[PDB]
PDB file of C-alpha atoms in Angstrom:
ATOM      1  CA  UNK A   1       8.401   0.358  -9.660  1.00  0.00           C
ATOM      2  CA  UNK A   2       6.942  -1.045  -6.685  1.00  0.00           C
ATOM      3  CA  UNK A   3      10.310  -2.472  -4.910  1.00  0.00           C
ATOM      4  CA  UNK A   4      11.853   1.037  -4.873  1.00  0.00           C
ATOM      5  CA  UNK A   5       8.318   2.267  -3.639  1.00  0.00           C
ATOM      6  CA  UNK A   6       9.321   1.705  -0.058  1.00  0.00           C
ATOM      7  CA  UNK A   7      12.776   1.081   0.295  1.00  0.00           C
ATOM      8  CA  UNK A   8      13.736   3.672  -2.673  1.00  0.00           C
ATOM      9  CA  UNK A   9      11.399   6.296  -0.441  1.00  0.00           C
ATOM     10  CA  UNK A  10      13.085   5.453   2.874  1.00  0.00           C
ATOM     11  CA  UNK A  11      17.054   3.730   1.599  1.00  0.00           C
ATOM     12  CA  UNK A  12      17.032   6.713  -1.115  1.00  0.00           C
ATOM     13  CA  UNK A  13      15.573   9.717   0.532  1.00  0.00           C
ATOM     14  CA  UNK A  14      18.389   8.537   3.919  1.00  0.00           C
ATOM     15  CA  UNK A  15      21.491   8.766   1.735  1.00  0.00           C
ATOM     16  CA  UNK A  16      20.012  11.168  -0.682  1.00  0.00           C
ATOM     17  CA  UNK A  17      20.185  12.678   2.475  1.00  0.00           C
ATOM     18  CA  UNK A  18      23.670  12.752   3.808  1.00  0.00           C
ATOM     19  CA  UNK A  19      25.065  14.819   0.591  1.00  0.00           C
ATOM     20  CA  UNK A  20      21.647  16.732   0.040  1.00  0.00           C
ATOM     21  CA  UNK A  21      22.759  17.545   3.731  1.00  0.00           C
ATOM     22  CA  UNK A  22      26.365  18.535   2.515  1.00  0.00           C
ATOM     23  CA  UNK A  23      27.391  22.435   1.939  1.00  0.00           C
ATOM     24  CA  UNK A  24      27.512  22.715  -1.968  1.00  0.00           C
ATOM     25  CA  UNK A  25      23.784  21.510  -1.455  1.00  0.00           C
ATOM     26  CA  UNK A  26      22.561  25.077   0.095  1.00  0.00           C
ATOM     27  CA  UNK A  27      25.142  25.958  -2.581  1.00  0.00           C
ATOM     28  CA  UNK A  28      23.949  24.273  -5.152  1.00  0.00           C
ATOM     29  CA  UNK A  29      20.552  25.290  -4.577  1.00  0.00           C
ATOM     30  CA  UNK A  30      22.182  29.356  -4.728  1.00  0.00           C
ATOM     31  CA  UNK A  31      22.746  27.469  -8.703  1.00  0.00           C
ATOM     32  CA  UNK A  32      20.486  25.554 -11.366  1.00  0.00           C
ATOM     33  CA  UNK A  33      20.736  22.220 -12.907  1.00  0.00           C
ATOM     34  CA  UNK A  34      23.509  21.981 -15.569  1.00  0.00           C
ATOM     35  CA  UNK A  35      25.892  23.828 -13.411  1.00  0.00           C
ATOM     36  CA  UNK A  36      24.802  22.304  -9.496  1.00  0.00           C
ATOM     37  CA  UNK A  37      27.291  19.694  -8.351  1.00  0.00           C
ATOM     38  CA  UNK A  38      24.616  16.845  -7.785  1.00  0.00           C
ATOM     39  CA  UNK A  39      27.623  14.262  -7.983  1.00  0.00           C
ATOM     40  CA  UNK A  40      27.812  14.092  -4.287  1.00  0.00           C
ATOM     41  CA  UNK A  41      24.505  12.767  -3.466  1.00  0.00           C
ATOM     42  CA  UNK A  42      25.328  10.630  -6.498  1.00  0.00           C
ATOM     43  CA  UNK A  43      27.337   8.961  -3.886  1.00  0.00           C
ATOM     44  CA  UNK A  44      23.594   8.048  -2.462  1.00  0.00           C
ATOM     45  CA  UNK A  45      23.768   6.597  -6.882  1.00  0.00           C
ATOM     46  CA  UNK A  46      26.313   4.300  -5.686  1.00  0.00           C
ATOM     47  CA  UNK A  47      25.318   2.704  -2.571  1.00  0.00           C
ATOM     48  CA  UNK A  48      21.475   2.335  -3.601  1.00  0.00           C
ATOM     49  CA  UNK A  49      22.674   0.674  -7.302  1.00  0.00           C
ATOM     50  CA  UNK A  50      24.730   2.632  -9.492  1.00  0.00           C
ATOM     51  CA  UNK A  51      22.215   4.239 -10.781  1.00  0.00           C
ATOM     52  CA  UNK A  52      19.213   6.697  -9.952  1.00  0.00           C
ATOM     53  CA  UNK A  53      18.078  10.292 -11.061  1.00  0.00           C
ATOM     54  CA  UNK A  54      19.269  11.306  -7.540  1.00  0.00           C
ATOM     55  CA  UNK A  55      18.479  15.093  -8.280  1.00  0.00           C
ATOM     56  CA  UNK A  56      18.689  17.898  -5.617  1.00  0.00           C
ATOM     57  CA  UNK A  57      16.637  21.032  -6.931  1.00  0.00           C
ATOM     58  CA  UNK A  58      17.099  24.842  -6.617  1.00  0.00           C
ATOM     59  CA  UNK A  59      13.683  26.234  -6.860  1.00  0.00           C
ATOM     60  CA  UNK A  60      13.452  24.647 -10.732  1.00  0.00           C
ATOM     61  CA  UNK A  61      13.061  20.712 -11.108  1.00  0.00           C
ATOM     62  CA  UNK A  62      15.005  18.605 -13.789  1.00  0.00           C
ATOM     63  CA  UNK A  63      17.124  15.488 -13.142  1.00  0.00           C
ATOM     64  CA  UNK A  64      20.121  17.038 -11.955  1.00  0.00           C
ATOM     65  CA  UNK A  65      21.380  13.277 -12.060  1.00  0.00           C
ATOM     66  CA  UNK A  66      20.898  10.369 -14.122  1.00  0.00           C
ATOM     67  CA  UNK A  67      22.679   7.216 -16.136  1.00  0.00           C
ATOM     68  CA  UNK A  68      20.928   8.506 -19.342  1.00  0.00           C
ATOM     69  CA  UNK A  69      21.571  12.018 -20.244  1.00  0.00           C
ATOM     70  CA  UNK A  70      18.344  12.175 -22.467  1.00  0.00           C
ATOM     71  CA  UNK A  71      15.676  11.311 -19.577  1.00  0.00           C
ATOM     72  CA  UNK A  72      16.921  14.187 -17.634  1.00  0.00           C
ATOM     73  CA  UNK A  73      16.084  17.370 -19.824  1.00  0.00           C
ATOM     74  CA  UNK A  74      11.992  15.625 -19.779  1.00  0.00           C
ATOM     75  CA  UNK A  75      10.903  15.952 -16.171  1.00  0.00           C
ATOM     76  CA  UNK A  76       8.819  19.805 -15.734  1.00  0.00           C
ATOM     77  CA  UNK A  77       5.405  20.610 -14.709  1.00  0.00           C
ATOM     78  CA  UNK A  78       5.509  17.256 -13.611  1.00  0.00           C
ATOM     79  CA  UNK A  79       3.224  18.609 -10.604  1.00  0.00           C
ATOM     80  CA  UNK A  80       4.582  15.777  -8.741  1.00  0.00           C
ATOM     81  CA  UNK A  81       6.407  18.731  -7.459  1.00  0.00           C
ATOM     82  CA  UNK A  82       3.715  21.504  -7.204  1.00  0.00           C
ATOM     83  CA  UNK A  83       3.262  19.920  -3.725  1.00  0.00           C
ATOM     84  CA  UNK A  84       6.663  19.360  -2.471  1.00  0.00           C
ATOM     85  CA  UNK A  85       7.943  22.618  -4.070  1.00  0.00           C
ATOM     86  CA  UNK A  86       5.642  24.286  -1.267  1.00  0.00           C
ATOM     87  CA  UNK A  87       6.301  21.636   1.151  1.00  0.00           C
ATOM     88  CA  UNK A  88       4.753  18.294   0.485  1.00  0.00           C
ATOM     89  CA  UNK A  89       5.934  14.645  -0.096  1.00  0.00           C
ATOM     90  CA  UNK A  90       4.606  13.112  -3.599  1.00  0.00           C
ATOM     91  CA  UNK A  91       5.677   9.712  -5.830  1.00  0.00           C
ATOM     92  CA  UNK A  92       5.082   8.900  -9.497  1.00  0.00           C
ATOM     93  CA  UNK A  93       6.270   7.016 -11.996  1.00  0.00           C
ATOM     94  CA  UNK A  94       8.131   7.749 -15.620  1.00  0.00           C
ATOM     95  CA  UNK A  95       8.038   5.621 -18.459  1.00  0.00           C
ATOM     96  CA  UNK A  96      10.834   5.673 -21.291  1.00  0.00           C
ATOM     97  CA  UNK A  97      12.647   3.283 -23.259  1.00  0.00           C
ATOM     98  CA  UNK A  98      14.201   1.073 -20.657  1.00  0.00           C
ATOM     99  CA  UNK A  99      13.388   4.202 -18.310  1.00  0.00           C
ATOM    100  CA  UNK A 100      10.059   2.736 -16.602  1.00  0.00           C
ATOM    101  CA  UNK A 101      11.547   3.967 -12.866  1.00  0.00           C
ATOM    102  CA  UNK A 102       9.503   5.345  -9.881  1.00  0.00           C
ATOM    103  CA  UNK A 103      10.633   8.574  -8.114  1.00  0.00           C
ATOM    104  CA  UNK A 104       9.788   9.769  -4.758  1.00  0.00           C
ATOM    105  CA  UNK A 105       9.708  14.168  -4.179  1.00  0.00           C
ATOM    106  CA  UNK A 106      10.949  16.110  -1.118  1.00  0.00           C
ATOM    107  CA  UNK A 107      10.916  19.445  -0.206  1.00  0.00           C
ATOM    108  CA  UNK A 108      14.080  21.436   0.776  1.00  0.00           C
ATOM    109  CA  UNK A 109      13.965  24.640   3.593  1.00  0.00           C
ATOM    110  CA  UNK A 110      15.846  27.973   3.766  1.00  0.00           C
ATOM    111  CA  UNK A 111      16.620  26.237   7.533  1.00  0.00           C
ATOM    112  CA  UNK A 112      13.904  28.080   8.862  1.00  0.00           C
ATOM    113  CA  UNK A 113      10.933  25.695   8.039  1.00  0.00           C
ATOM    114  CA  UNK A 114      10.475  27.617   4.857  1.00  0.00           C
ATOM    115  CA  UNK A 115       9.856  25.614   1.700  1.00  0.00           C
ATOM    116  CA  UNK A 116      12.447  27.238  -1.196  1.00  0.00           C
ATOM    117  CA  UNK A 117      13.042  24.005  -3.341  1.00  0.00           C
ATOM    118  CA  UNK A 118      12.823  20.463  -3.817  1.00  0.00           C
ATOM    119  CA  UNK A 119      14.852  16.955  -3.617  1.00  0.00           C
ATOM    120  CA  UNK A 120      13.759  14.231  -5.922  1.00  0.00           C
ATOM    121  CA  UNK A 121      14.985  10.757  -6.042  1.00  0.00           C
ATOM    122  CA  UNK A 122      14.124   8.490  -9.715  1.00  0.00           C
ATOM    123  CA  UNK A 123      15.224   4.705  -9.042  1.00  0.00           C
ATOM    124  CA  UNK A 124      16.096   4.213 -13.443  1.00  0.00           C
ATOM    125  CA  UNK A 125      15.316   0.385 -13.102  1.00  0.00           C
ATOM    126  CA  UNK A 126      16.948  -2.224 -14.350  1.00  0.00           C
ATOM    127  CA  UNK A 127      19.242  -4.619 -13.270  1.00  0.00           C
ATOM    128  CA  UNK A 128      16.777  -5.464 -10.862  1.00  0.00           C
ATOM    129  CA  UNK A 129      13.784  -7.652 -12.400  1.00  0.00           C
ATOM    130  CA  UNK A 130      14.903 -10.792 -11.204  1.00  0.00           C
ATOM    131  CA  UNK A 131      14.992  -9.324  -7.116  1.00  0.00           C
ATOM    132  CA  UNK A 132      11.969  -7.186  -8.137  1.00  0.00           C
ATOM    133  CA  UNK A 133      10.209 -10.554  -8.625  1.00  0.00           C
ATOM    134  CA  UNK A 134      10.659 -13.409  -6.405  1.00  0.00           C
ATOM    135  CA  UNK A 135      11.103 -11.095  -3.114  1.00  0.00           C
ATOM    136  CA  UNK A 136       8.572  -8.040  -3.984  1.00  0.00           C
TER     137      UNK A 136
END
């Protein structure tokens, strides 16, 4: 929730980062959701806290990745990504059984400045509260 609000946006969208930067990326992005290979930037999963939605997007938005499999199939229209879709940075929050998790949006280019898709990052939540409390 609000912890992940700046360090999720900055720790998540950096690793998020170094497999969104990979090759199946691009490659993944040529693909959709059930058959993308989001399990590298998953890697970003791992070092931020075992868990996250870390999702990578062709030009069609869903939770490529998440602990739950149920949560994922939800996200659409959200039009948390009707900005970064076209280019545009956007947050918001989700709210499901256990689920209540922000999630930061990204946009992704052809490599020539061109908006074509979008990276999203959804922090799940959890083991957490106690950290979430005292230090945020």
């Amino acid at each position: 929730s609000d912890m992940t609000r700046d360090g999720l946006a900055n720790k998540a969208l950096a690793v998020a980062r170094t497999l969104a930067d990979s090759p199946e990326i691009r490659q993944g992005l040529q693909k959709k959701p059930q058959e993308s290979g989001i399990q590298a930037i998953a890697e970003a999963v791992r070092k931020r806290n075992d868990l996250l939605f870390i999702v990578v997007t062709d030009m069609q938005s869903l939770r490529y990745s998440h602990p739950e499999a149920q949560r994922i199939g939800q996200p659409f229209k959200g039009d948390d990504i009707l900005k970064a879709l076209n280019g545009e940075e956007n947050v918001a929050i989700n709210r499901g059984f256990l689920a209540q998790a922000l999630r930061v949006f990204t946009p992704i280019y052809d490599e020539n400045h061109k908006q074509i898709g979008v990276v999203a990052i959804g922090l799940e939540l959890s083991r957490v509260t106690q950290q979430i409390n005292d230090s945020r």
